[PDB]
Amino acid sequence: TFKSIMK
Amino acid sequence: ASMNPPPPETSNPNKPKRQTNQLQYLLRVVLKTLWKHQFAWPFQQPVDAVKLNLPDYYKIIKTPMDMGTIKKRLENNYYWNAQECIQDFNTMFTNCYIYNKPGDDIVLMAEALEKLFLQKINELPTEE
């Protein structure tokens, strides 16, 4: 998910 | 709701301060070791649920916590007891497992960090 690729 | 909450407090001049060998260990060894782990970055700052477009994040997670906050708390002598710091780490990990689902890469990342955390905590020095 996006949570593992951006912050 | 869509907005992020204010980040957790990291400094309070009204709280008594002390230096202990366990608090020093938590900053110098535990926090630092975790910080440099390749999977640390999602945990180095508060979850920005606006940027990530996750409006339910702060509906599900009511005690947010992250390593950036923990680090600053240690640096500001915010913790009197090592246990307060350890509790914040545990809150961080459990929030991740609560919000996300078992198979998600972010959970894999958290689990790796947690394994390292437990190794370092098992080596926590006896109080001096």
UniProtKB/Swiss-Prot annotation, chain A:
Record function comment: NF-kappa-B is a pleiotropic transcription factor present in almost all cell types and is the endpoint of a series of signal transduction events that are initiated by a vast array of stimuli related to many biological processes such as inflammation, immunity, differentiation, cell growth, tumorigenesis and apoptosis. NF-kappa-B is a homo- or heterodimeric complex formed by the Rel-like domain-containing proteins RELA/p65, RELB, NFKB1/p105, NFKB1/p50, REL and NFKB2/p52. The heterodimeric RELA-NFKB1 complex appears to be most abundant one.
Protein name as catalogued: Transcription factor p65
Modified positions (N6-methyllysine) in chain numbering: 3
Disease: A chromosomal aberration involving ZFTA is found in more than two-thirds of supratentorial ependymomas. Translocation with ZFTA produces a ZFTA-RELA fusion protein. ZFTA-RELA translocations are potent oncogenes that probably transform neural stem cells by driving an aberrant NF-kappa-B transcription program.
Subunit structure as annotated in this protein's UniProt entry: Component of the NF-kappa-B p65-p50 complex. Component of the NF-kappa-B p65-c-Rel complex. Homodimer; component of the NF-kappa-B p65-p65 complex. Component of the NF-kappa-B p65-p52 complex. May interact with ETHE1. Binds TLE5 and TLE1. Interacts with TP53BP2. Binds to and is phosphorylated by the activated form of either RPS6KA4 or RPS6KA5. Interacts with ING4 and this interaction may be indirect. Interacts with CARM1, USP48 and UNC5CL. Interacts with IRAK1BP1. Interacts with NFKBID. Interacts with NFKBIA. Interacts with GSK3B. Interacts with NFKBIB. Interacts with NFKBIE. (Microbial infection) Interacts with human respiratory syncytial virus (HRSV) protein M2-1.
Superkingdom per UniProt: Eukaryota
Modified how: Ubiquitinated by RNF182, leading to its proteasomal degradation. Degradation is required for termination of NF-kappa-B response. Polyubiquitinated via 'Lys-29'-linked ubiquitin; leading to lysosomal degradation. Monomethylated at Lys-3 by SETD6. Monomethylation at Lys-3 is recognized by the ANK repeats of EHMT1 and promotes the formation of repressed chromatin at target genes, leading to down-regulation of NF-kappa-B transcription factor activity. Phosphorylation at Ser-4 disrupts the interaction with EHMT1 without preventing monomethylation at Lys-3 and relieves the repression of target genes.
Residues bearing the modification Phosphoserine: 4
Organism listed in the record: Homo sapiens
Cell location: Nucleus; Cytoplasm
Record's comment describing the protein's domains: The transcriptional activation domain 3/TA3 does not participate in the direct transcriptional activity of RELA but is involved in the control by RELA of the accessibility of target gene promoters. Mediates interaction with ZBTB7A.
Chain positions found as N6-acetyllysine: 3
UniProtKB/Swiss-Prot annotation, chain B:
PTM section of the record: Phosphorylation by CK2 disrupt the intramolecular binding between the bromo domain 2 and the NPS region and promotes binding between the NPS and the BID regions, leading to activate the protein and promote binding to acetylated histones. In absence of phosphorylation, BRD4 does not localize to p53/TP53 target gene promoters, phosphorylation promoting recruitment to p53/TP53 target promoters.
Tissue expression from the record: Ubiquitously expressed.
Per UniProt, location of the Glycyl lysine isopeptide (Lys-Gly) (interchain with G-Cter in SUMO2) cross-link in this chain: 59
Ranges where the Bromo domain occurs: 18-124
Subcellular location: Nucleus; Chromosome
Record-annotated site: Acetylated histone binding: 100
Source superkingdom: Eukaryota
Record disease entry: Cornelia de Lange syndrome 6: A form of Cornelia de Lange syndrome, a clinically heterogeneous developmental disorder associated with malformations affecting multiple systems. It is characterized by facial dysmorphisms, abnormal hands and feet, growth delay, cognitive retardation, hirsutism, gastroesophageal dysfunction and cardiac, ophthalmologic and genitourinary anomalies. CDLS6 inheritance is autosomal dominant. A chromosomal aberration involving BRD4 is found in a rare, aggressive, and lethal carcinoma arising in midline organs of young people. Translocation t(15;19)(q14;p13) with NUTM1 which produces a BRD4-NUTM1 fusion protein.
Family per similarity comment: Belongs to the BET family.
Subunit structure: Interacts with p53/TP53; the interaction is direct. Interacts (via CTD region) with CDK9 and CCNT1, acting as an associated component of P-TEFb complex. Interacts with RELA (when acetylated at 'Lys-310'). Interacts (via NET domain) with NSD3, CHD4, BICRA and ATAD5. The interaction with BICRA bridges BRD4 to the GBAF complex. Interacts (via NET domain) with JMJD6 (via JmjC and N-terminal domains); the interaction is stronger in presence of ssRNA and recruits JMJD6 on distal enhancers. Interacts with NSD3. Interacts with NIPBL. (Microbial infection) Interacts with bovine papillomavirus type 1 regulatory protein E2. This interactions may serve for the tethering of viral genomes to host mitotic chromosomes allowing successful partitioning of the viral genome during cell division.
Protein role: Chromatin reader protein that recognizes and binds acetylated histones and plays a key role in transmission of epigenetic memory across cell divisions and transcription regulation. Remains associated with acetylated chromatin throughout the entire cell cycle and provides epigenetic memory for postmitotic G1 gene transcription by preserving acetylated chromatin status and maintaining high-order chromatin structure. During interphase, plays a key role in regulating the transcription of signal-inducible genes by associating with the P-TEFb complex and recruiting it to promoters.
